[PDB]
Design a protein around this ligand. Structure first.
Ligand SMILES: [Mg+2]
Ligand SMILES: [Zn+2]
Ligand SMILES: [Zn+2]
Ligand SMILES: [Zn+2]
Lengths: 97, 49, 263, 185, 113, 436, 204, 66, 133, 51
RNA sequence: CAAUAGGAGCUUAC
């Protein structure tokens, strides 16, 4: 099955569904439902899909690093000023960005 | 001025292709080769040159 | 063993078949006649008064491109091997051009025949701009209106076509061999049949076409070369050919000299 | 159910031939311009100055802006006004146009190459190129050394470039007769 | 502004030799000759002349860069023969062939009148 | 500035670490910069106006840093996709394809010149493949001379036997080619090819010299062979023209049938897709397959002496779509993912009738570039090319912004001596780099 | 005068710069002795699909042989086949190929060469208007950094992406040297107690 | 501007033929026949004379300023 | 002084793919099941169907830097019409008595089947092939 | 003059006299003052009504 | 032994 829209928790419960394999393309939902490691897995899957769509191949470690930086704090850290500049790093780095 | 800045000892001109150059070789115009410079400390192995 | 068969021979062009020589020899001769046969051409221009619409370096380029009679240029010296300072009489030819339009209607054309030889290493027959006939007007140089004037002192010197094209005695050296592709040195592009789609060489009737029963020969080298030398009037065709041969001979003699005197 | 007449300033417009469309005469369906009009244009006068404006005022060419263009059916060439009865593997297939039983044309292009501008008009055979290359030439042809004016010697500008020996092109477009590219190559 | 002079193709400096010979030690009885201020005209002539001798085992030339007017030639010969003597022999042979060619052209041109 | 000085050489934009590399200097006249042609790929450069910057290191520490970290030989393999980024390109590829064909033979004098042209030749003349009645070398021998010894490569292309009837696949034993045309699949920038093998076995210096050896040999052979392209290389014979036009007419009939089915309400919709979107998707499928089939016909018609076919087969420029558009059919133009929209009221151009959904009305170009486009096809193709130019002009800003943000997010992340991957705060991002 | 690095184009988007120049005797020639002014690479036609370039070369050849100007107006009934028929009627290979010889050796080329006249343009971008080098020169008053401009003898910007590439390379010393010793390096005195640059220094 | 002395491609002298070419054009002869009689046989030489545009006539019309 | 002498009857010749190169198939006239596939230069040694070729494989031509042969010296190749040099790149000691040898003559390929007792001595580094008629 | 901001720029330009066709094109040029502040690619597109 | 700044406009290569 494929669907439009997202309700992961209720569909995982419906009898007849493989509750151990339901997946969502919205990793914020994954984080709210399945935790942070499953969020990392989903994030890697999405990034691999976006890159390998056209037959491009990026080595694993680069996308692994990108998803590990985005999930290191326990929650999703966006690649924006609202994400990068809310860290505890020095003031000069944050101002330089 | 801090993340990026203008620098001395640089050059710019149109590039051309040369089948007879090695892979790690670049052909430098004579005028640029004379305008740019490298500071070489004088030692007892390079004093004649 | 080398042989020459002249097919057409006039003053400006000679068409000849060369045979029993290597292709390298024939191509070296073509290259020598195109590039290394000395001639005479204006290499220094002095403007006194130029009030024409054309620019000074425009006129200088055109004057440098004017063919001059160079029959005796080989008895002359290169201006870099003479002890003299600013041009003397033996390594240069000095020309004058004076032109002027008087009146307020019409245009006065300045032609290459108006160039006048003043000095030069007499009695050598060098320097004069080449005229096709007795009634030739020569090359167009400039045009003049009311009160416009041109006063120029040109110097002519000896040089070769390697340094600059204005010293080239030749225009086009047509050159070909093996009209029937017996040696299979080319491989004809075609759509349906390579024999119908390709025009015959102008020397096709000079050689027997291959027989259908014939097999390919792997011993045959190129042996007959059909070439047509043309000149610009500065030198004659036989003169261009003979001096190209002589220039090649002296280049080889120079190599031999350096080899022997390197021992 | 609207009728809009515009006399505004600043509207862009272009001329077209007028195909006779009144469905009452044998002259229906073909161009109103004939060989007398071309004879008059070459002559330079009517047989009791005859130029473009006389064609416009005689009702054989009219101007249309983009809005009016919505309502018209423009034939691409004067031959498209009649269906032909060919099989030429070299000449390009003029489109079939089979869906429509009977065409009622109202206008014809004077010449299809006129859709191009000044810079694109220099290009020879622009219909054999992919469009980005035509765009690059339209940009690059403006940077080409020539003779901008014949009085460049009595003018004093910051910079000027004049080609020594300009040559007209061996392959030329009809538009360049009007662009003076053969007079100032 | 960076263009060298068009006469450095042919004018030999005083500090630059016309010809310089070094030996190729990898194979026996071989030499490397650099001709300064020459081009394909002399190189191809000499190469195709030398390539037809029985005692010449290797002969080749190249112009490493078109913007520099020289070529380098590798020539190997058999045990008894020296590549230098074969080089003089080839030069002399081409000179003689050109002299015969010139004589025949002049006689033919006179006959054509 | 003198010969062999290391200088940093750079072209903007500098999208990756191999856009700015250190080169050795060779002084030359004629005020342009000179580049070997295999390094133009990492710079994304060509020679139609480009300019590049040169930075001179002013100390010995920076000279050593440039020569031991940024040098061109050290960047041949990239970490982006663990494959080489420098390959054989753009004429050496076509020439090596022509040279390593099975029926390419070379006489002794040209062989001698090619051997002397190889900078790393050891002075040993290889035995000719044929000894009688006339010594002949094959192009594979002369190319194998370029390859260093101790290299073994083996590739299978569509299950070829060891006798290779098509001369496909690849076998290299001790640096000698046994069979297989040498093309993009062997000397390109793909992974597992010859360049990657030589890089991994011999080091960066020998792999760098391989580029020069192959370039010089192939360039000499192509100089004395020649390679051209003309108007005749885009022309297919009459029977192929009949086949192509028949295929296009059949596809036009198929589209007309789809239109009839849609208009009398009998078309079968698809999930998550509207009836109009289903109609458009089916028509687009049909026309794309029409163009592909006409292109296949044109490609089969091309002889082995066709120059476009040689360039495509070498993989040095062009592809099957280029052949198709030049000789058979330009095909369908797309603006914003759809066919040509009804910019006028219910039509694409004012030369069409209302509500005409035929392929010609909505942006199908039936002609080829050789045959010439009609004014309508010309305008539609102009719209499509304009869309492409706008896309290229407009997406680059979003891409540059994205890459700047990624760099700022990841700029402070380094692998430490204990194996961990930490940021400037010392926080762990990965306990082991790459997990391996 | 044109030289290496000057930019030229034909009227079909085929721009390029001069890579090298060859003399009359070095260039390939046809059997009639005609040599080209210009040799472009075949690899610019296929992926760019500039068929009009080849068609215009063919038409120009025919026009120059028959002594008129070819009409290349778009959307006319002219075809390549008619042009090839004219060219063949003039005694030339109908597709514009010619048997040419190698200038270096005079040997025939194994392949035939597409040959003929084409209208080229001299673009305003000359290398001599672009070549710039700077060792040391004027600096800005405010920032004391190299000025901006080729005409002003300025320096080149070592922007942020160049810094990213140097960081990827791990060349820390080179980056410090670009940003300090090749640019506005300065010396200031700080207070060991307050850490402000409020130190009054009299070095003499 | 004014007729070039030489042919660019090969170097034949064409600068002495512009007036003859114009005279040939006055009596009605078409361009190819005129180029044939002047013995311009290679299409490089032919396009040298056939494509020349004589701009010096236009430049000469502005009064000399001396 | 030869490794494998034999006479073959040419079965098929596919000129086909190339212009100077043709692939031939031939079974021995005296010992069938010995198959020979061979690429040959057409212009140097043209071959037609049903022709009979004396094919020799040798490890030398005597009775490392190639030099042109003189007229005065002699070698094994003097008695043949078509001589090629190649590299053995696969020796298939395979099924019961199917033995396949692969030789590459500068990209012109050869395969030779037959019983082990015929091709046992064909396990070398480089092989010459010589042909008559 | 004192309201240079909020006024249209580039309405007048230095006539391009590099070559004749460049002058002829500059005299026939058009400019939509949409501005580059905004990535709407729609007004940059060649449109059917442009014919 | 010392060659302003700020703006706007048109362009070059991606
Ligand atoms: Mg570029
Ligand atoms: Zn003197
Ligand atoms: Zn303090
Ligand atoms: Zn000419």
């Amino acid at each position: 099955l494929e669907t439009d829209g997202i309700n992961l928790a209720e569909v995982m419960a419906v009898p007849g569904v493989d509750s151990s394999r339901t997946y969502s393309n919205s990793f914020v939902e994954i984080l709210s439902v399945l935790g942070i490691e499953a969020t990392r897995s989903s994030l890697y899957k999405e990034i691999l899909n976006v890159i390998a769509f056209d037959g491009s191949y990026v080595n694993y470690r680069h996308m692994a690093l990108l998803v590990d930086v985005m999930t290191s704090r326990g929650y999703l850290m966006a690649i924006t000023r609202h994400g990068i500049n809310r860290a505890d790093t020095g003031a000069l780095m944050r101002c330089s960005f | 001025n801090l993340m990026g800045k203008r620098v001395d000892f640089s050059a710019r001109t149109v590039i051309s292709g040369d089948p007879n150059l090695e892979l790690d070789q670049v052909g430098v115009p004579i005028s640029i080769a004379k305008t740019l410079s490298y500071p070489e400390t004088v030692t007892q192995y390079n004093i004649h040159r | 063993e080398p042989k020459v068969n002249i097919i057409n021979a006039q003053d400006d062009e000679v068409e000849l078949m060369l045979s029993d020589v290597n292709l390298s020899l024939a191509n070296s001769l073509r290259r020598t006649m195109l590039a290394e046969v000395p001639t005479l051409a204006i290499d220094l221009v002095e403007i006194k008064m130029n009030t024409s619409v054309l620019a000074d370096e425009f006129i200088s380029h055109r004057l440098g491109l004017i063919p001059l009679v160079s029959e005796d240029v080989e008895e002359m010296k290169y201006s870099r091997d003479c002890t003299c300072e600013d041009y003397c009489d033996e390594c240069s030819v000095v020309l004058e051009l004076s032109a002027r339009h008087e009146g307020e209607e019409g245009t006065t054309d300045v032609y290459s025949s108006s160039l006048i030889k003043v000095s030069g290493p007499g009695n050598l027959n060098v320097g004069e701009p080449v005229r096709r006939d007795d009634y030739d007007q020569g090359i167009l140089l400039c045009k003049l209106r009311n009160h416009q004037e041109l006063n120029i002192r040109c110097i002519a010197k000896k040089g070769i076509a390697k340094e600059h094209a204005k010293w080239s005695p030749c225009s086009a050296i047509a050159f070909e061999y093996d009209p029937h592709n017996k040696l299979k040195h080319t491989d004809f592009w075609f759509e349906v049949d390579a024999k119908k789609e390709w025009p015959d060489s102008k020397y096709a009737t000079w050689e027997e076409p291959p027989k259908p029963g014939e097999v390919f020969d792997y011993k045959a080298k190129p042996n007959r070369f059909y070439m047509t030398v043309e000149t610009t009037g500065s030198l004659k065709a036989n003169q261009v050919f003979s001096r190209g041969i002589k220039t090649l001979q002296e280049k080889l003699a120079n190599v031999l000299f350096e080899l022997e005197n390197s021992r | 159910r609207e009728f809009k007449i515009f006399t505004d300033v600043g509207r862009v417009y272009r001329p077209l031939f007028i195909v006779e469309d009144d469905e009452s005469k044998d002259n229906k369906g073909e161009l109103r311009i004939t060989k007398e009009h071309i004879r008059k244009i070459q002559q330079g006068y009517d047989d009791d100055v005859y130029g473009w404006s006389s064609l416009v005022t005689s009702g054989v060419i009219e101007y249309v802006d983009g809005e009016e263009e919505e309502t018209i059916m423009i034939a691409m060439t004067p031959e498209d006004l009649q269906t032909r009865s060919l099989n030429d593997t070299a000449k390009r297939i003029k489109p079939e146009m089979s869906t429509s039983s009977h065409h009622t044309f109202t206008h014809c292009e004077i010449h299809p190459s006129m859709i191009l501008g000044v810079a694109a008009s220099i290009i020879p055979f622009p219909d054999h190129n992919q469009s980005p290359r035509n765009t690059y030439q339209s940009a690059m042809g403006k940077q080409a050394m020539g003779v901008f004016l014949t009085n460049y010697n009595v003018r004093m500008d910051t910079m000027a470039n004049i080609l020594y020996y300009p040559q007209k092109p061996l392959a030329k477009t009809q538009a360049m007769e009007y662009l003076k590219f053969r007079e100032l190559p | 502004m960076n263009a060298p002079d068009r006469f450095e193709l042919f004018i030999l400096p005083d500090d630059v030799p016309k010809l310089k010979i070094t030996p190729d030690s990898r194979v026996p009885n071989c030499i490397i000759i650099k001709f300064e201020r020459e081009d394909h005209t002399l190189a191809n002539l000499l190469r195709e002349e030398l390539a037809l001798y029985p005692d010449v085992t290797f002969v080749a030339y190249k112009v490493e860069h078109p913007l520099f007017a020289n070529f380098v030639m590798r020539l190997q010969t058999e045990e008894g023969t020296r590549p230098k003597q074969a080089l003089e022999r080839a030069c002399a042979s081409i000179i003689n062939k050109l002299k015969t060619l010139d004589h025949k052209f002049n006689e033919e041109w006179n006959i054509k009148n | 500035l003198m010969d062999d000085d290391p200088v940093l050489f750079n072209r903007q934009p500098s999208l990756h670490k191999m856009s700015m590399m250190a080169h050795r200097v060779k002084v030359m006249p004629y005020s342009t910069f000179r580049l070997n042609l295999s390094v133009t790929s990492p710079y994304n450069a060509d020679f139609d106006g480009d300019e590049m910057n040169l930075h001179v290191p002013q100390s010995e520490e920076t000279r050593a840093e440039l020569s031991q970290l940024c040098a061109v030989p050290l960047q041949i393999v990239s970490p982006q996709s663990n494959k080489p980024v420098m390959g054989i390109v753009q004429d050496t590829l076509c020439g090596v394809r022509k040279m390593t064909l099975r029926d390419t033979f070379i006489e002794y004098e040209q062989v001698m010149n090619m051997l002397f042209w190889v900078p790393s030749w050891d002075g040993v003349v290889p035995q000719p493949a044929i000894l009688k009645p006339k010594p002949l070398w094959t192009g594979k021998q002369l190319l194998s001379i370029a390859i260093p010894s101790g290299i073994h490569l083996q590739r299978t292309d569509g299950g070829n036997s060891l006798l290779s009837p098509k001369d496909n696949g690849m076998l290299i034993v001790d640096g000698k080619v046994m069979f297989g045309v040498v093309d993009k699949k062997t000397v390109g920038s793909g992974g597992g090819g010859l360049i990657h093998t030589v890089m991994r076995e011999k080091g960066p210096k020998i792999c760098a010299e391989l580029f020069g050896n192959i370039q010089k040999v192939v360039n000499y052979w192509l100089l004395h062979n020649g390679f051209s392209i003309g108007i005749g290389d885009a022309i297919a014979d009459a029977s192929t023209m009949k086949e192509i036009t028949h295929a296009i007419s059949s596809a036009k009939e198929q589209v007309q049938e789809i239109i009839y089915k849609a208009q009398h309400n009998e078309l079968e919709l698809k999930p998550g897709m509207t009836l109009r979107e289903s109609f458009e998707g089916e028509v687009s499928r049909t026309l794309n397959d029409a163009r592909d089939s006409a292109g296949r016909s044109a490609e089969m018609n091309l002889k082995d002496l066709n120059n476009v076919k040689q360039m495509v087969s070498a993989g040095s420029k062009g592809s099957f779509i280029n052949i198709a558009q030049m000789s058979a059919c330009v095909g369908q133009q797309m603006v914003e993912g759809k066919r040509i929209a009804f910019g006028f009221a219910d039509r694409s151009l004012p030369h069409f009738t209302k509500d005409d959904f035929s392929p010609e009305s909505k942006g199908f170009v039936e002609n080829s570039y050789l045959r010439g486009l009609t004014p309508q096809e010309f305008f539609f193709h102009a719209m499509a090319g304009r869309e492409g130019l706008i896309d290229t002009a407009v997406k680059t800003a979003e891409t540059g912004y994205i890459q700047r943000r990624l760099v700022k997010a990841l700029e402070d992340i380094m692998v430490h001596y204990d194996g961990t991957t930490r940021n400037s705060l010392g926080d762990i991002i990965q306990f082991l780099y790459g997990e391996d | 005068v044109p030289q290496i690095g000057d930019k030229f184009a034909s009227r079909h988007g085929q721009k390029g710069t001069i890579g090298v120049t060859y003399r009359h005797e070095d260039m390939p020639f046809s059997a009639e002795g005609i040599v080209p002014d210009l040799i472009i690479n075949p690899h610019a036609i296929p992926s760019r699909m500039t068929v009009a370039h080849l068609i215009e070369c063919l038409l120009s050849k025919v026009g120059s042989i028959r002594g008129y100007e070819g009409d290349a107006t778009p959307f006319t009934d002219l075809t390549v086949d008619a042009v090839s028929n004219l060219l063949r009627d003039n005694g030339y290979q109908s597709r514009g190929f010619e048997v040419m010889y190698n200038g270096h050796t005079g040997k025939k080329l194994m392949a035939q060469v597409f040959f003929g006249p084409t209208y080229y343009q001299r673009l305003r971008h000359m290398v001599d208007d672009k070549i710039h080098a700077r060792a040391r020169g004027p600096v800005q008053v405010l920032t004391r950094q190299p000025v901006e401009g080729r005409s002003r003898d300025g320096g080149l910007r070592f922007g942020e992406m160049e810094r990213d590439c140097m960081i990827a390379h791990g060349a820390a010393g080179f980056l410090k040297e670009r940003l300090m010793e090749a640019s506005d390096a300065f010396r200031v005195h700080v207070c060991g107690i307050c850490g402000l640059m409020s130190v009054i220094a009299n070095l003499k | 501007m004014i007729i070039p002395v030489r042919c660019f491609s090969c170097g034949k002298v064409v600068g002495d033929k512009w007036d003859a070419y114009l005279r040939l054009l006055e009596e009605g002869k078409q361009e190819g026949d005129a180029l044939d009689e002047l013995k311009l046989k290679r299409y490089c030489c032919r396009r040298m004379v056939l494509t020349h545009v004589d701009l010096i006539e236009k430049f000469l019309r502005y009064n000399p300023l001396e | 002084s030869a490794l494998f002498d034999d006479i073959f009857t040419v079965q098929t010749v596919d000129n086909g793919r190339y212009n100077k190169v043709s692939r031939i198939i031939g079974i021995s006239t005296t010992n069938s099941a010995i198959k020979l596939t061979l690429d040959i230069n057409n212009e140097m040694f043209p071959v037609s169907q049903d022709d009979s070729l004396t094919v020799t494989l040798a490890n030398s031509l005597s009775l490392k830097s190639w030099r042109p042969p003189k007229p005065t010296d002699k070698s094994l190749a003097d008695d043949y019409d078509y001589v090629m040099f190649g590299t053995v790149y696969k020796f298939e000691e395979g099924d019961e008595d199917k033995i396949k040898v692969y030789v590459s003559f500068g990209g012109l390929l050869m395969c030779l089947e037959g019983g082990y007792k015929s091709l046992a001595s064909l396990k070398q580094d480089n092989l010459y092939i010589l042909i008559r008629r | 003059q004192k309201k240079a901001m909020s006024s249209r720029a580039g309405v007048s330009q230095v006539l391009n006299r590099y070559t004749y066709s460049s002058t002829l094109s500059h005299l026939r040029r058009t400019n939509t003052p949409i501005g580059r502040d905004g990535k709407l690619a729609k007004p940059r597109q060649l449109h059917n009504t442009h014919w």
